[PDB]
Amino acid sequence: GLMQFTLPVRLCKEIELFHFDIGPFENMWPGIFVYMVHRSCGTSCFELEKLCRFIMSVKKNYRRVPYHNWKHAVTVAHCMYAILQNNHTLFTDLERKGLLIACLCHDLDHRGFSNSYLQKFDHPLAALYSTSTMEQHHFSQTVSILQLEGHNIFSTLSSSEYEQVLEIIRKAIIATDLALYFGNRKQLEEMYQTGSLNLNNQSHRDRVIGLMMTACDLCSVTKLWPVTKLTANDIYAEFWAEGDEMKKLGIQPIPMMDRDKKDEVPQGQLGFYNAVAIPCYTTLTQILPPTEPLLKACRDNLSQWEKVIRGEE
Numbered sequence: 001g002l003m004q005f006t007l008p009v010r011l012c013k014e015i016e017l018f019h020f021d022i023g024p025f026e027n028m029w030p031g032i033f034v035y036m037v038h039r040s041c042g043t044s045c046f047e048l049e050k051l052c053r054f055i056m057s058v059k060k061n062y063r064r065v066p067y068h069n070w071k072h073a074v075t076v077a078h079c080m081y082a083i084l085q086n087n088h089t090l091f092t093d094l095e096r097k098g099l100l101i102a103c104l105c106h107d108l109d110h111r112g113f114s115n116s117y118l119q120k121f122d123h124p125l126a127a128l129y130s131t132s133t134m135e136q137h138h139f140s141q142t143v144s145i146l147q148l149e150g151h152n153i154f155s156t157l158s159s160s161e162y163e164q165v166l167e168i169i170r171k172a173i174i175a176t177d178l179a180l181y182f183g184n185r186k187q188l189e190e191m192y193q194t195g196s197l198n199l200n201n202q203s204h205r206d207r208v209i210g211l212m213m214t215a216c217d218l219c220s221v222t223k224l225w226p227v228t229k230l231t232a233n234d235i236y237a238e239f240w241a242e243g244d245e246m247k248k249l250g251i252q253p254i255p256m257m258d259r260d261k262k263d264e265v266p267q268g269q270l271g272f273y274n275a276v277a278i279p280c281y282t283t284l285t286q287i288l289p290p291t292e293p294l295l296k297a298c299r300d301n302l303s304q305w306e307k308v309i310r311g312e313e
């Protein structure tokens with residue numbers, strides 16, 4: 001009950017900033033996550049014995065892939081933690097509880113391949129879930145870990161609070177399907193501008209939590225340049241492996257996935273920042289103004305990719 005996690009001084013301060021990197025010491029990531037839950041939520045939200053057993057089962061069920069791995073889970077939960085802490089009064093107790101777990105669980109048992117590749121391979125998951133294939137699987141894997149003896153961190157919620165939180169986590173994880181981001185953001189842009197945005201309308205809150213999930217998921221582009229650049233090697237390592245597998249099925253991959261086209265990476269990052277990242281954090285800054293540091297860090301990194309193209313690094 002009276003047992004806080006404390007971090008060393010540099011982490012205790014930097015963890016509150018959007019651009020915080022959780023570092024290369026894996027054994028500290030669980031304590032960082034618990035630290036974030038205790039400050040975002042209270043030392044009571046969860047039974048420590050139970051939370052600790054849920055965190056280590058989740059860890060176990062992420063794979064050793066270059067990008068979509070345990071480090072990503074915790075990094076995406078941290079960005080959510082920073083958004084929640086800079087917007088204290090906008091979110092319910094339930095939403096704080098559900099969204100940190102949603103983020104930690106959002107890529108469970110990812111194998112390093114897109115929904116596209118599962119469908120062209122004809123993977124069994126592609127017959128069971130025809131859209132948002134991996135995302136329906138990640139939510140499925142979350143419910144499975146919650147129902148292991150001694151893993152139900154929500155067991156002290158009322159039956160109705162319990163159904164509300166699983167529903168928040170389900171919509172939160174499905175929203176990490178980038179194919180659903182483009183339409184969700186368009187609707188939010190139209191609602192915010194025509195003045196109809198209403199955070200007491202549940203379907204509007206749904207949409208907003210969805211945008212938050214895309215912003216946390218893409219938060220590699222909001223870090224200091226050296227973190228952003230080294231993460232891109234990890235991201236491209238999964239993409240090019242997926243490309244190699246496309247060629248094994250006799251399909252030319254899209255250029256993003258073709259390792260023969262390493263040369264064009266800088267221009268391909270420009271497109272990504274311009275079509276996805278900048279508009280994501282722009283709309284997110286309009287709805288939730290304290291998240292502006294994410295938009296500013298993203299613009300700084302676009303400008304660093306422009307410098308790479310102009311031969312200046």
Ligand SMILES: Cn1cc(Br)cc(C(=O)Nc2cc3nc(-c4ccccc4)[nH]c3cc2C(=O)NC2COC2)c1=O
Nearest residue numbers: 178218220221235255256261264265268269272275276
């Ligand atoms: C999910 N997620 C999380 C992060 Br963080 C970064 C990424 C990411 O880098 N995306 C991209 C990298 C790319 N590189 C090239 C490219 C490389 C070489 C030669 C020619 C082209 N084209 C690219 C397109 C995208 C991309 O998705 N475009 C969106 C807009 O329509 C779908 C990501 O997909």
Ligand SMILES: [Mg+2]
Nearest residue numbers: 106107134176
């Ligand atoms: Mg994902």
Ligand SMILES: [Zn+2]
Nearest residue numbers: 106107176217
């Ligand atoms: Zn992810």
